[PDB]
Nucleic acid binder design. Sequence first.
RNA 1: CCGAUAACGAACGAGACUCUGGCAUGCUAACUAGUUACGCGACCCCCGAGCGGUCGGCGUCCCCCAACUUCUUAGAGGGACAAGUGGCGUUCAGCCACCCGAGAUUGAGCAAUAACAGGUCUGUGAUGCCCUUAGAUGUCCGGGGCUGCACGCGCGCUACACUGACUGGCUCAGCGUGUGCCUACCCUACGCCGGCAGGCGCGGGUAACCCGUUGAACCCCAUUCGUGAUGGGGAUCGGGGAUUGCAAUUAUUCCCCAUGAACGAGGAAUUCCCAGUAAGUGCGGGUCAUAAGCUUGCGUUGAUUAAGUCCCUGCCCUUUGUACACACCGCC
Lengths: 189, 113, 64, 135
Amino acid sequence: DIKLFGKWSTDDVQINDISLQDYIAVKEKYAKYLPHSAGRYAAKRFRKAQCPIVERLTNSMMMHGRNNGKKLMTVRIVKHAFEIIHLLTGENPLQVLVNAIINSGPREDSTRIGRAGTVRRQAVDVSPLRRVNQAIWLLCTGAREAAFRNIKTIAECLADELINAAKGSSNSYAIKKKDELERVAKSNR
Amino acid sequence: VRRACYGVLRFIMESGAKGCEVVVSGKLRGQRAKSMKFVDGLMIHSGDPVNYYVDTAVRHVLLRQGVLGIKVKIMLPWDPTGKIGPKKPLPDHVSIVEPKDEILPTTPISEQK
Amino acid sequence: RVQPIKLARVTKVLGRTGSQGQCTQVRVEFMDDTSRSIIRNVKGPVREGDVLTLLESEREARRL
Amino acid sequence: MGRVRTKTVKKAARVIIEKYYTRLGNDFHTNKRVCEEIAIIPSKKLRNKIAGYVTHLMKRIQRGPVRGISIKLQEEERERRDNYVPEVSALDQEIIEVDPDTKEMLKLLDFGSLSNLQVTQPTVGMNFKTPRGPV
RNA sequence: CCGAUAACGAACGAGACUCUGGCAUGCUAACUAGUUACGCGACCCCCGAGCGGUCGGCGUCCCCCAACUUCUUAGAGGGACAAGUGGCGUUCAGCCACCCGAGAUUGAGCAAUAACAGGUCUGUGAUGCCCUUAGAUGUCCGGGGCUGCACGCGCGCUACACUGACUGGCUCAGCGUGUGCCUACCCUACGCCGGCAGGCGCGGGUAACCCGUUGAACCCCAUUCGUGAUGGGGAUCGGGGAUUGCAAUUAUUCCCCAUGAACGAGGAAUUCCCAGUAAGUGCGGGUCAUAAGCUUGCGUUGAUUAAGUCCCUGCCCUUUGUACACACCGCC
Ligand SMILES: [Mg+2]
Ligand SMILES: [Mg+2]
Ligand SMILES: [Mg+2]
């Protein structure tokens, strides 16, 4: 019905945990034909919670301070990486992306005001909006650092970290920081 | 200076105004110079109405000990509505006009004309 | 041995804490012992009435 | 939350409301217009905060009086009170419980006989005498 | 301000307003703005189509050979200013959410009582006192300097590259500016020569008529590069060509061909910011004979995060204390 980029039908993707069912933004109710709209989403809260997840990607990869208006860079790179993924695993790049999102979203952090042990004092759970926010940020920044001094363009970096996180491989920088945050929090329990 | 400014304040008030402000600056007798402000009545301070309700003037007085700074600020009562007092009264004056009795509690009454 | 990951609906929030807004009291329930709920501090937006993952139930309980 | 104010910025609406007691409501867009053009109030943002609970006042007056004070509240709401003057007497029963002390000092006004003045028995034992101590 | 209430009745700042931003196919009107329809002319497929479509080409105010203001403009208005609902609260003074709506907070101007030995006497023919006043601390002229460099600090700009550079092709803005009192000095189209810098004819414009439909940058799409301090970067450094200036050296500025240094994302610390926001990215004005890494504005692209707190810094009110009152950078 919506044929994302001429393909990748929305009514295929399955999200696992119902603490995220409503908080991933891939589904048909708001299935955009493309991740781009000046929709005043960040004006008030919780609209960006509904902002399509691919739109969040294209708006988050657009972050270095050198590139600051090149959203079209972002959509072209994400479309290329989506094509790359659908080539890599045959299944929906939307599906692999949501899998990486859930598998790289942390749950435990440390935050207090007292004398911090290693990061903070008290371990604390995270609500699944800062969780997915940090997850997509981590994916993006992994892609950026990976393509910084490599011949690989950001398209393939994003693709490979997306696969690595979705499967879970202890090699993508995203999950490699996720589990360290989780375990240092467990130490500061 | 006090007697003179009180006299001018008297005369301005009898001229009829919502208020006034006068400030005298400079060095009086003695070498330490400080101002001293005489006020009466109303004195709006902020927003557009000051541009066309209060008028101000600054004059420098060539005194043997130096110079005297004089500020005067009079406002014009609105009521003339175009005369020496300007029209468009201050917005906090939407005055409630008062009906008549408008009771008429009698029976339905017909008068033909 | 380790307590399983458990889900947690969030009811009315008591309010922020950490004297910076960094944490908030949430009153979660495990949708199975629905008559048992626990006070709990979380970070990030709460979206009153949403649901949250949880590893260890009996972690903390402090009243402001 | 965002539920912390100053009493002073709370001091916002009754500079207006009763002064123009004639044109309020229970309301969201048309006492809006009346509040646009009615004072010297130099800047833009705070129009909503003065005027939010404003029509909540005439909500109140449509269920109860309040300061205010709107000179229309009190005389109407007390004129309603003016009525309901009972036909029968609230005290006309012509028997009244009285204790022996009462009867006897009516005997020092020298009348305890020409009426009903029905006597109730005294407490006798008198479980009154408000308490004191432990044991 | 409710609410209390030895207070009552007022005044200033504060929250209206002014402009700006957000809408009206509602009003008035547009040959210095147009838009349509038409009639032309050129065009294309034409085998014919044909009301197929192209034109920022021409004309429809030299007086009908057509109308209209929608697009643009700017005035009048209106319009957005707690009307509806639910929920919270003594249900009291506002918010939360939702509906609808151009919009449920558009940013600025102003701004009280007082006060600061804050700065300015280099703004003035504003000025007191003092100083100088002919071998002038006046004034003008010539030259130099304000640019000077073992070092330390501030604001910035460019970069450290492949979300890139190079080359070529494509497609878009908005403020605002423009010919002279003195004062000479404007914005510039078009054409010709010169690779460029430029020059020479040739107009238009004192401006919604010309520059200008401001054919902006970023960005767009094809090429090359390949992770090399490399085609990144462009400091330093030679020679040549222009331009303004009476005068250009310590280089006014620009252009060409040359040279290719640090820089491989920076500590200790520290600044700004939350919606067209920060930032990328250009364009105007002032400065200006030549002058922008400055600044003021204008746009273009366009975010992440948060709707909390006193943790640091600091501020307002209330109680407390005190030996302080030049008021804790105090006192002792
Ligand atoms: Mg103001
Ligand atoms: Mg090179
Ligand atoms: Mg004390």
